[PDB]
RNA sequence: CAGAGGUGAAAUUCUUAGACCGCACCAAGACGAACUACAGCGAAGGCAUUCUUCAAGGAUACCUUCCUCAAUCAAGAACCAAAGUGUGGAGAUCGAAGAUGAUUAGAAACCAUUGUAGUCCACACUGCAAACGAUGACACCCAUGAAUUGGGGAUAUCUUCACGUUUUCUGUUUUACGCGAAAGCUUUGAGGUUACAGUCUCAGGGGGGAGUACG
């Protein structure tokens, strides 16, 4: 996995990945527009 | 020491329990409708000096047809009424 | 005599899953094992046979609706609207 | 409410009969004066009774209430669908 | 301009929005979808305080007439308004000055109406339930 | 001072005492 | 530059000017009824009539009735503290297919010899009065074309029917139709529009 | 036996209703 | 097309691919101005758009029925503004916490621009308010003049029901003996009490510690 390894259990790089990533690299939050806990109204999800 | 037998509002011993509050005209403070001082005002759009100029230059308004006025109801809190 | 104070049908779980999850699952379990009213045959005869299948042994009939209850609150609006439009 | 009061009076002082089979028997013997049917009835089951009433020229009243409602109006603790009045 | 004789009158609509912060002098047609001149009181004074003053609104009216006569309009229908909504309904200080300067400049005043928005039942307005503690 | 503020102080002290008692027990 | 033409129900047509055909159509033009009908009754001076453009012929804009409303200064003036104000909303579909919504306001008056402070009505009589108003309006306005409907409202001949036929129920100080709006129109017809305008005025 | 009896009664009654309805329609037409 | 906003004055903001302004429309969520008052309804908390609908509540009328079936209460039970809690919706406006401007020796505040929880709905909790008429419930007597809401009885005007006069029952307000330390109360008492007894019921005993500690 891209997330595996290390002396502590952690991801070393941001977990938001690009939409153009090759298969095998596209793990994590894919083409995310935003992250974290939403405060306020929840928008619609989709293209 | 009671200051007013009506306690500053038109609500007797027990006939109502609650009255919808309203905003004051100036500061916007919330006060009960029966406690707020309320006046209805009708006023002219222009004063005498300006009315004569407009009436002369208007083919519609004149001696027979009067000019429109502004009619509004104003409710104030007890503090805003004294200061004004 | 009374066999449990407050832990009712959930008393089979022991001390094992958390108070709030057990309290949340209890209402649905009670309603799913209850017996519900049959509009035809006019009596309490509906029983659940699978996650959405309700069967009345009196009239010999099967009805579709609800996971843990015979009728969902959303369906009442649909029936009311349909009846009103038909009345028009 | 008038029909309920009338049925109560008939039950207090008269002769009546409950049940589809017994109502049909009264119609066959020509000893019936009025038949009352509840609203929640199967179409064919109610249709046989209505056909017999029409053939025998017997008046028929539609209760517009549940069978449990008709039982309560009759002052019973059981549900009844059909009622036949033989003597008033 | 339009194909009319010198005597014939061409009619427009002037919207006068007089708040406490500023003053608007907007001239449109009867439909309201096309505008000719729009001059505000803040385009003639170098200080924020003087934007609504009756003097500032007076100059906004005169420069409307200069361009309007070029466009071929000589008469105007008046539509005055205040902030309205959930705020004060009293018009600002510049409403009188803006209308008067139009008459003396040589504009034939038509009919005057009040078009301040008014709610049948409104939303909550600014300030707490204690009002503004000035 | 204001009786409401004094009551707030009392409530805070009582909450602290309850927490301390629970931890010490 | 263009010219706006009112339908044949009004005498003084060509009441406005404006400064590409697709954009022009749909605009709403507002005029005062006292200017069109050219009358000095001092009561039609408080009515504004709106028209909507449906077709452009050369430099002439051919319009159709949109709405009518009483000015705010007149409406505000007819309010009294110790009376009762009643309102009625009526929706009626004409023969052509135009459905319009009407708002009617009525006020009470004291009797000649009445010695009371107020003149409040009773809820039973207010509801009865409201029921009569909607019945007669729905009857007369549903059997006429759009041209006759506008003439009835503008000439102030329908309103005099209610005051005469509902005064026995309650003594009325005044009864007016506050606002009229067209909320639905049928499919567009070129033949119908030309018939309404008759002979159009020429434009330069 | 109950299913057979129910089918017999249903057949007869439905056919009678159909005949009456069609005759009413034709009598209204003519 | 060159600014708009905000203020005591400004700065907090926004605007040339373009705000502010004007016209018609679309979407969603709250809310029903003016008329609205010493008015009406509810046990209290509370309750204002129209039509349809369900179960109630009070007064009035009566030569209807019944015949003491009643008043007030430990224990027990039900409802109860706002804020707050849990689970699902909704999210327009306003807005605790927070952020950035002002102000100020100082501003954490009062002022300006924003902004999360909240605010709205359903179900389940909480059980507190200057929850005030700071005045427990039931019954009798009581002087004058006002009014006004609902019903009923008798005998001047208007249109094709409203109103006028006088009585009456129920509510709801204003303006004498007597009482009170006084302010004041006064047919709806805080009156009829040292000339002290109609019935029941809940609290108090100088001020703090304290509505605190333990259970
Ligand atoms: K209260
Ligand atoms: Mg700046
Ligand atoms: Mg804000
Ligand atoms: Na790797
Ligand atoms: Na870890
Ligand atoms: Na980790
Ligand atoms: Na300014
Ligand atoms: Na400015
Ligand atoms: Na009691
Ligand atoms: Na709440
Ligand atoms: Na502030
Ligand atoms: Na809520
Ligand atoms: Na208390
Ligand atoms: Zn104020
Ligand atoms: Zn069944």
Rounded CA separation B24/E128 (Å)? 12
Asked whether residue B35 is marked as a ligand-binding residue, the answer is yes
Verify whether the Cβ–Cβ distance G28 to E111 is below 8 Å: no
| Residue carrying the six token digits 């109610």 | D46
Asked whether residue B73 is marked as a ligand-binding residue, the answer is no
Kindly report the backbone phi and psi dihedral angles of residue E41, in degrees, each rounded to the nearest multiple of 5, phi listed first: -70, -15
Verify whether the Cβ–Cβ distance E111 to B60 is below 8 Å: yes
Decide: C42 and C30 in contact? Cβ < 8 Å: no
- Which residues in chain B touch residue G45, judged by CB atoms under 8 angstroms apart? 65
Rounded CA separation G18/G3 (Å)? 7
The experimental method is cryo-EM
The string of DSSP letters for G37-62 reads HT---SSGGGEEEEEEEEEEETTEEE
Q: Which two tokens stand for residue F8?
A: 């707030």
Q: How far is CA E61 from the centre of its chain?
A: 9
Query: CB burial class (10 A; 0-12, 13-18, 19+) of residue E70?
Result: exposed
Verify whether the Cβ–Cβ distance E109 to B54 is below 8 Å: yes
- Which residues in chain D touch residue C39, judged by CB atoms under 8 angstroms apart? 40
Give the other-Cβ count within 10 Å of C30's Cβ: 13
Helix ranges, E39-93 (H):
54-71
Q: How far is the CA of D78 from the C1' of I69 (A)?
A: 35
Burial state string for E108-123 with b = 16 or more CB within 10 A and e = fewer than 16? bbbbbbbbbeeeeeee
**Which of D49, D51, D53, D54 would best serve as a mutation to test chain H binding (most H beta carbons within 10 A)?**
D51
Sheet holding C36-38: strands in order across? Answer: C36-38, C43-50, C53-56, C61-64
Q: How far is the CA of E116 from the C1' of I100 (A)?
A: 34
Rounded CA separation G122/G169 (Å)? 11
Q: How far is B37 from chain E (nearest CA, A)?
A: 16
Residue B68: closest CA among chain G residues belongs to which residue?
A: G73
Q: How far is G72 from chain E (nearest CA, A)?
A: 7
If we measure between CA atoms, which residue out of E74, E44, E75 comes closest to residue E57?
E44
If we measure between CA atoms, which residue out of E64, E104, E76, E105 comes closest to residue E11?
E76
Rounded CA separation H21/H15 (Å)? 10
Decide: G85 and G105 in contact? Cβ < 8 Å: yes
Rounded CA separation D50/D56 (Å)? 10
Q: Which two tokens stand for residue G11?
A: 């005498």
The nucleotide minimizing the C1' distance to residue G111's CA is: I163
Q: What is the DSSP letter of B67?
A: P
> Which chain B residues have any C-beta within 8 angstroms of a chain E C-beta?
21, 23-25, 27-30, 45-47, 50, 53-54, 56-61, 67-68, 70, 72, 77
E33 inside 8 A of chain G by CB: yes
Distance in Å, CA E25 to ligand 8 centroid: 15
Residue B80: closest CA among chain E residues belongs to which residue?
A: E131
Q: How far is the CA of F18 from the C1' of I209 (A)?
A: 22
Q: Which two tokens stand for residue G126?
A: 């207010």
E-facing residues of G in 60-79 (CB < 8 A) are 71-73
Q: How far is D9 from chain H (nearest CA, A)?
A: 35
Q: Which two tokens stand for residue B51?
A: 């009315």
If we measure between CA atoms, which residue out of A25, A34, A32 comes closest to residue A2?
A25
3-state secondary structure of D21: helix
The nucleotide minimizing the C1' distance to residue E79's CA is: I22
């Amino acid at each position: 996995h891209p997330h595996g390894g290390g002396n502590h259990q952690h991801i070393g790089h941001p977990s938001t990945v690009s939409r153009h990533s090759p298969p095998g690299q596209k793990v994590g939050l894919i083409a995310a527009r935003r992250t974290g806990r939403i405060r306020g109204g929840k928008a619609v999800k989709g293209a | 020491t009671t200051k007013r037998r009506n306690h500053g509002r038109s609500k007797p011993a027990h006939s109502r329990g609650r009255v919808k509050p309203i905003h004051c005209f100036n500061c916007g403070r919330l006060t009960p409708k029966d406690k707020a001082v309320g006046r209805f005002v009708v006023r002219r759009m222009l004063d005498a000096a300006s009315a004569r100029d407009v009436a002369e230059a208007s083919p519609v308004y004149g001696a027979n047809f009067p000019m429109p006025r502004l009619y509004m109801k104003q409710r104030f809190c007890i503090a805003c009424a004294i200061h004004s | 005599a009374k066999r449990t104070v407050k832990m009712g049908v959930m008393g089979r779980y022991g001390t094992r899953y958390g108070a709030n999850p057990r309290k949340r699952a209890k209402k649905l379990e009670v309603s799913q094992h209850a017996k519900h009213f049959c509009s035809f045959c006019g009596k309490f005869a509906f029983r659940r046979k699978a996650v959405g299948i309700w069967r009345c042994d009196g009239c010999s009939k099967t009805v579709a609706g609800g996971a843990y209850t015979l009728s969902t609150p959303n369906n009442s609006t649909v029936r009311s609207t349909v009846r009103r439009l038909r009345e028009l | 409410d008038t029909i309920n009061a009338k049925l109560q009076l008939v039950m207090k002082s008269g002769k009546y009969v409950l049940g589809t089979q017994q109502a049909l028997t009264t119609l066959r013997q020509g000893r019936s004066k009025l038949v009352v049917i509840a609203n929640n009835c199967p179409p064919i089951r109610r249709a046989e009774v209505e056909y017999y009433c029409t053939l025998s020229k017997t008046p028929i009243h539609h209760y517009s209430g549940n069978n449990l409602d008709l039982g309560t109006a009759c002052g019973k603790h059981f549900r009844t669908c059909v009622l036949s009045v033989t003597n008033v | 301009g339009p194909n009319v004789k010198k005597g014939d009158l061409v009619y427009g609509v002037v919207h006068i929005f007089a708040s406490f912060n500023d003053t608007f002098v907007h001239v449109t047609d009867m439909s309201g979808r096309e505008t000719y001149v729009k001059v505000t009181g803040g385009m003639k004074v170098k200080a924020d305080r003087d934007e609504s003053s009756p003097y500032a609104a007076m100059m906004a009216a005169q420069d409307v007439v200069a361009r309007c006569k070029e466009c071929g309009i000589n008469a105007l229908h008046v539509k005055m308004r205040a902030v309205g909504g959930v705020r004060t309904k009293s018009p600002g200080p510049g409403a009188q000055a803006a209308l008067r300067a139009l008459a003396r400049a040589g504009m034939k005043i038509g009919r005057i109406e009040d078009v301040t928005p008014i709610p049948t039942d409104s939303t909550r307005r600014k300030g707490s339930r204690r009002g503004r503690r000035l | 001072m204001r009786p409401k503020w004094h009551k707030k102080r009392i409530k805070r002290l009582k909450l602290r005492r309850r927490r301390m008692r629970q931890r010490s027990k | 530059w263009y010219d706006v033409v009112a339908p044949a129900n009004f005498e003084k047509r060509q009441f406005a000017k404006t400064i590409a055909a697709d954009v022009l159509r749909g605009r709403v033009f507002e005029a005062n009824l006292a200017d069109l009908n050219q009358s000095a009754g001092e009561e039609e001076a408080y009515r504004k009539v709106r028209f909507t453009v449906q077709e452009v012929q050369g430099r002439n804009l051919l319009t159709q009735f949109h709405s009518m409303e009483v000015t705010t200064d007149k409406m505000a003036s007819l309010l009294r503290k110790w009376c009762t104000t009643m309102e009625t909303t009526v929706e009626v579909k004409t023969a052509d297919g135009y459905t319009m919504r009407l708002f009617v306001v009525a006020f009470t008056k004291p009797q000649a010899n009445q010695q009371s402070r107020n003149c409040y009505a009773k809820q039973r009589l207010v509801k009865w009065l409201r029921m009569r108003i909607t019945k007669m309006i729905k009857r007369r306005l549903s059997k006429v074309q759009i041209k006759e409907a506008v003439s009835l409202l503008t000439r102030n001949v329908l309103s005099d029917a209610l005051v005469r036929r509902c005064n026995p129920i309650l003594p009325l100080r005044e009864l007016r139709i506050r606002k009229v709006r067209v909320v639905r129109t049928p499919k567009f017809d070129a033949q119908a529009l030309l018939s309404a305008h008759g002979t159009i005025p020429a434009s330069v | 036996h109950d299913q057979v009896r129910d089918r017999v009664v249903r057949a007869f009654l439905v056919e009678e209703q159909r005949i009456v309805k069609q005759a009413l329609k034709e009598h209204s037409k003519m």
